[PDB]
Design an enzyme around this catalytic site. Sequence first.
Site, PDB file in Angstrom:
ATOM      1  N   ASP A 334       0.835  -1.188   0.000  1.00  0.00           N
ATOM      2  CA  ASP A 334       0.000   0.000   0.000  1.00  0.00           C
ATOM      3  C   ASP A 334       0.891   1.267   0.000  1.00  0.00           C
ATOM      4  O   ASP A 334       1.757   1.329  -0.867  1.00  0.00           O
ATOM      5  CB  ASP A 334      -1.052  -0.088   1.132  1.00  0.00           C
ATOM      6  CG  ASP A 334      -2.056   1.047   1.107  1.00  0.00           C
ATOM      7  OD1 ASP A 334      -2.982   0.996   0.266  1.00  0.00           O
ATOM      8  OD2 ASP A 334      -1.905   1.996   1.919  1.00  0.00           O
ATOM      9  N   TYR A 465      -1.563  11.257   2.254  1.00  0.00           N
ATOM     10  CA  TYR A 465      -2.416  11.561   1.100  1.00  0.00           C
ATOM     11  C   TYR A 465      -2.461  13.028   0.725  1.00  0.00           C
ATOM     12  O   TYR A 465      -3.068  13.354  -0.283  1.00  0.00           O
ATOM     13  CB  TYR A 465      -3.867  11.185   1.410  1.00  0.00           C
ATOM     14  CG  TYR A 465      -4.110   9.706   1.559  1.00  0.00           C
ATOM     15  CD1 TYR A 465      -4.423   8.922   0.462  1.00  0.00           C
ATOM     16  CD2 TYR A 465      -4.084   9.101   2.807  1.00  0.00           C
ATOM     17  CE1 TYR A 465      -4.703   7.572   0.600  1.00  0.00           C
ATOM     18  CE2 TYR A 465      -4.344   7.749   2.956  1.00  0.00           C
ATOM     19  CZ  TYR A 465      -4.680   6.995   1.852  1.00  0.00           C
ATOM     20  OH  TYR A 465      -4.976   5.668   2.002  1.00  0.00           O
ATOM     21  N   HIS A 523      -7.362  -6.547  -0.322  1.00  0.00           N
ATOM     22  CA  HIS A 523      -6.412  -5.483  -0.062  1.00  0.00           C
ATOM     23  C   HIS A 523      -5.422  -5.777   1.072  1.00  0.00           C
ATOM     24  O   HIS A 523      -4.264  -5.406   0.973  1.00  0.00           O
ATOM     25  CB  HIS A 523      -7.139  -4.146   0.190  1.00  0.00           C
ATOM     26  CG  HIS A 523      -6.175  -3.037   0.485  1.00  0.00           C
ATOM     27  ND1 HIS A 523      -5.407  -2.468  -0.519  1.00  0.00           N
ATOM     28  CD2 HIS A 523      -5.770  -2.540   1.679  1.00  0.00           C
ATOM     29  CE1 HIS A 523      -4.610  -1.607   0.093  1.00  0.00           C
ATOM     30  NE2 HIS A 523      -4.798  -1.617   1.412  1.00  0.00           N
TER      31      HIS A 523
HETATM   32  C1  4VY Z   1      -1.165   3.224  -1.978  1.00  0.00           C
HETATM   33  N1  4VY Z   1      -2.261   3.980  -2.546  1.00  0.00           N
HETATM   34  C2  4VY Z   1      -3.630   3.622  -2.225  1.00  0.00           C
HETATM   35  C3  4VY Z   1      -3.960   4.298  -0.914  1.00  0.00           C
HETATM   36  O1  4VY Z   1      -5.239   3.870  -0.474  1.00  0.00           O
HETATM   37  C4  4VY Z   1      -2.002   5.111  -3.362  1.00  0.00           C
HETATM   38  C5  4VY Z   1      -0.684   5.472  -3.624  1.00  0.00           C
HETATM   39  C6  4VY Z   1      -0.391   6.581  -4.408  1.00  0.00           C
HETATM   40  C7  4VY Z   1      -1.437   7.317  -4.935  1.00  0.00           C
HETATM   41 BR1  4VY Z   1      -1.108   8.828  -6.017  1.00  0.00          BR
HETATM   42  C8  4VY Z   1      -2.725   6.906  -4.658  1.00  0.00           C
HETATM   43  N2  4VY Z   1      -3.021   5.835  -3.888  1.00  0.00           N
HETATM   44  C1  4VY Z   2      -7.030   2.805   2.327  1.00  0.00           C
HETATM   45  N1  4VY Z   2      -8.296   2.327   2.851  1.00  0.00           N
HETATM   46  C2  4VY Z   2      -8.928   3.019   3.960  1.00  0.00           C
HETATM   47  C3  4VY Z   2      -9.975   3.987   3.467  1.00  0.00           C
HETATM   48  O1  4VY Z   2     -10.805   4.312   4.572  1.00  0.00           O
HETATM   49  C4  4VY Z   2      -8.880   1.134   2.339  1.00  0.00           C
HETATM   50  C5  4VY Z   2      -8.256   0.442   1.303  1.00  0.00           C
HETATM   51  C6  4VY Z   2      -8.812  -0.727   0.797  1.00  0.00           C
HETATM   52  C7  4VY Z   2     -10.000  -1.188   1.340  1.00  0.00           C
HETATM   53 BR1  4VY Z   2     -10.819  -2.768   0.715  1.00  0.00          BR
HETATM   54  C8  4VY Z   2     -10.585  -0.462   2.356  1.00  0.00           C
HETATM   55  N2  4VY Z   2     -10.049   0.673   2.852  1.00  0.00           N
END
Ligand code: 4VY
Ligand code: 4VY
Lengths: 546, 546
Positions: A334, A465, A523
């Site tokens: 992630d 973020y 996930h």
């Molecule tokens: C790792 N993720 C998903 C976060 O929920 C991510 C990474 C970079 C960008 Br830009 C957007 N999402």
């Molecule tokens: C990154 N998050 C938290 C958003 O509140 C996430 C990512 C994948 C799943 Br499935 C649920 N939540």
Amino acid sequence: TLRAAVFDLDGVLALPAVFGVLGRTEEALALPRGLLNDAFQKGGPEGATTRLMKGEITLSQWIPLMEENCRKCSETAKVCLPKNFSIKEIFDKAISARKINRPMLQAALMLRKKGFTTAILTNTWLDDRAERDGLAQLMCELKMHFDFLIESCQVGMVKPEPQIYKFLLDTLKASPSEVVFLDDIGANLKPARDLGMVTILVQDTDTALKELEKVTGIQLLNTPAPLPTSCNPSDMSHGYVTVKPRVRLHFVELGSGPAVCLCHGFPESWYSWRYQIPALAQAGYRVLAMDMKGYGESSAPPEIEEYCMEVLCKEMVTFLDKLGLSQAVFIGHDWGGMLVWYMALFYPERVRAVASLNTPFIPANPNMSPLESIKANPVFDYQLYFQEPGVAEAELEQNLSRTFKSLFRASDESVLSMHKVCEAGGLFVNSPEEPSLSRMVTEEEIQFYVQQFKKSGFRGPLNWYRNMERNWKWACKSLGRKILIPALMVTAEKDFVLVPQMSQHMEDWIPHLKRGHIEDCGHWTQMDKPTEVNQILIKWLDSDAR
Amino acid sequence: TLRAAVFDLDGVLALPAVFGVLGRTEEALALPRGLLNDAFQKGGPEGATTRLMKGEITLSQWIPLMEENCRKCSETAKVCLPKNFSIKEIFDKAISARKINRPMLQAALMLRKKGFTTAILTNTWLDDRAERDGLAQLMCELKMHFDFLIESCQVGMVKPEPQIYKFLLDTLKASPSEVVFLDDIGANLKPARDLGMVTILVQDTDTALKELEKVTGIQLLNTPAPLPTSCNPSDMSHGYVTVKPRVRLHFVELGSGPAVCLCHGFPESWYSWRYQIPALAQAGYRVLAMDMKGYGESSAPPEIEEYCMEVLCKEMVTFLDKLGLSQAVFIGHDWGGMLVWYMALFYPERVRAVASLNTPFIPANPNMSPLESIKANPVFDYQLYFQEPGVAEAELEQNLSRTFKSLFRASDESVLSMHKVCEAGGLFVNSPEEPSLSRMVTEEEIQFYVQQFKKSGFRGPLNWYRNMERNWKWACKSLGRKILIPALMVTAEKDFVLVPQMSQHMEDWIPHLKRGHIEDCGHWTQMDKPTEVNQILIKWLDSDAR
Ligand SMILES: CN(CCO)c1ccc(Br)cn1
Ligand SMILES: CN(CCO)c1ccc(Br)cn1
Ligand SMILES: CN(CCO)c1ccc(Br)cn1
Ligand SMILES: CN(CCO)c1ccc(Br)cn1
């Protein structure tokens, strides 16, 4: 009524029995039957072997005494020992061949899960050979699964002396009829049975396990494959490094060998690697599982710009510098996976190898703002909701138990719609106040995360973020580069946000990229399919990061 | 007036210059003069090498572009390149041969000690070769000695562009006439000189150092050998392991490679190994310097029996188990040295190798109480004084500054008579209230120990002396054993309590024992003769513990 189970090491928890190599050595070398077994027991309680088992002498001191015994036995038998006869060679090969009897260890682990007190009671020696590390590694893997380990050479007593069984009962705080005792040597069962203990003579593992099932009423044979060993937070070594005046990073460390740094995602912890940490250390790696900046016991400054990728990567380089590590293998998931690709692009000299779970490497587009690309995909709507400081914090901090119970679910247990989050006014607007517990986690595991997020809240984690534009500008400096160091991308079939399809063009940037794919995995890869993640990482580490 | 010094890496801090291997490759391969240097600079600011130095591309991407340039230059020169011509081989050998220019690093370290701000400003690349670890190790050793490291590939600028000098001045917070700039490339000095900086063209090291001395007024050449690098406590990784419910051990960790556990004596700290920790990590070992039980940040329970050798050794085994280390090399001094011999006798499988500074291995006498043996030697009279609980604590805790200033002295600076301590009524009865500072320690180093002993006092440390009979009974179980694993005994000539003569019969118990001897060295071996201790330990570790 039964509440304790005692196992022998040699011939019971570890096979083949070192005592059984004497018989096969006689057959192979055409020596008279029982010659080596008689030299081994020569003298009884006053003999060299009893002194060895009591700890009076070490293995290296006993070897030349066993050689005299082999020659004295050969003189009476009117036979000659071969020219290249060596007790050292015979014992080194026997000790080396002995491996854990997995079905027996699994039965011990199952009994311990059902409330039994488990122990190893063994006749063993002080090993001072140059190859002693092999035995040390075996004892380390076994001892973590038992409540007690009683070794003859440490207590000065041996089986079958009745005092060792009295010492065992005292240590267990149990009466003899509450104890099952497993041994492959009949003579060693006799004193346990005189006291009133249930005894099982172990000839073959399956029959011993069937007897054990009948006497405990617990199913041990034909049972499902257990989950990998997990971490107990209070048993880990905790490390703390100050990378800059206001920033201290916390990590948990286990193992020896090449350094492997684990980087978790949002909203997680070092604890999200609980199933990988013992497995990776047992495979021969020194594991460092971080609390990333903003999380758990690491510093959580409030400023947004403290969480842009450029600062985060520089602090990870300082972390290696302060620990004295020229390199580490970086494994992320992630947000942590996003960080490990940028560590490889900007600091390749410090990265031995790089692996990402779910997170693909997506190069920055210089013609398009990252905030406009996020709007083009409706599943990334929750990221727009995370932009305004204070808003998502209030919702996520309102009820911590509900937050983790709603998030940490398998793909078929989902209770949140990740799209139309902004329009609905929240993440948990159409969600139950009391979500059911997922089959992926226990209540105790959920409470660990609740305790961790009670300390610094969600501000630090959410700031990861809030640097979209700064990260975009920084990443644009690396558009002319390629990733030419060993790399692994692991995709998760049922991750509906980080879909496997988002990784399909990664070979253009990382031409020698290796791949892994996990079916029926959501996930939360590490806790959803822990056995599969472990197997993929260990195989890749052994071939590309060593 | 001068307050900052800037050094280049290639050709200044590291020799030979990688840029100088092109000239020697031409001579060896009989290529036209300057052919490889022209291919290297081919294109100027728009050429492959400028893109490499700015970080646009990595070293592995640049290698095939430098090969095209080598062929284009050969076509105009009407010459042919050999069959086995490889830019990769040439650069791998050049980077590998480059070592730190010790006199230049020593001059930088001396200037930094005299208040100067030091920096490295270099044109370098993103190294992604399979051999990149060699460069990473070099940069790690150098960066710890400088305030700033500015690398072209990280800032997107190169020398001689004037913007890199403006960026340098901004980072240093200094005006040009306050800066000395050292470089081996004339073209790179020109912009620094236009700004008003003092420039030194480095052709040979000695002439550059003579120029540097004349301009700073500080002696750099012909100066005494500096002390080894020491630790800054706030820059170390601190680790914490709970070995049992009331007992947590603290340690400091640095380096990668085989585990080396350092065990201090009385009344000391992990900080007593400050000169060995960076040296041992640089030699390729993972150093774990403990706060022993009763000291600093480790638990200090009050019970006497919590400090008997049997409990202390078992907790050290649990410490290895919780860290996931099957073995460690154990190095001890004073009480720590006594502990490491017992770790080798009782747990040889967990001890890779064993070394003791000052403390000999003396086997227990079953016919004589250890308390009666201590009375037979008048220099061990202070140990009888330490027996009654509360007495020595009150004297040692009364004035902590005086306690450490009186104890930590070189052999010719002693202010305490170790005999007739009981008859005199104390340790400091004929001692000055304000002792002078020893040449061995600074005031700042003394204050570290004062701060550490303010936390738990002397009860825990003194309890190590109050288990004479229990330790004697325990050690008697090992009288039939020998130490047959790699072992080192280091004696200190001027230690008047642990005299070298007390170690003379150790070969009867440890037949393959290796020895070291330090002349003009008192009891506090590590801080008295740090360079000598380091050299003896590193040589022994490389030959016997690897
Ligand atoms: C790792 N993720 C998903 C976060 O929920 C991510 C990474 C970079 C960008 Br830009 C957007 N999402
Ligand atoms: C990154 N998050 C938290 C958003 O509140 C996430 C990512 C994948 C799943 Br499935 C649920 N939540
Ligand atoms: C390490 N020392 C000297 C302490 O000052 C020591 C060790 C064991 C015995 Br018994 C006596 N002294
Ligand atoms: C062990 N001690 C402290 C006694 O107060 C000691 C050892 C050697 C020298 Br020299 C001085 N003190």
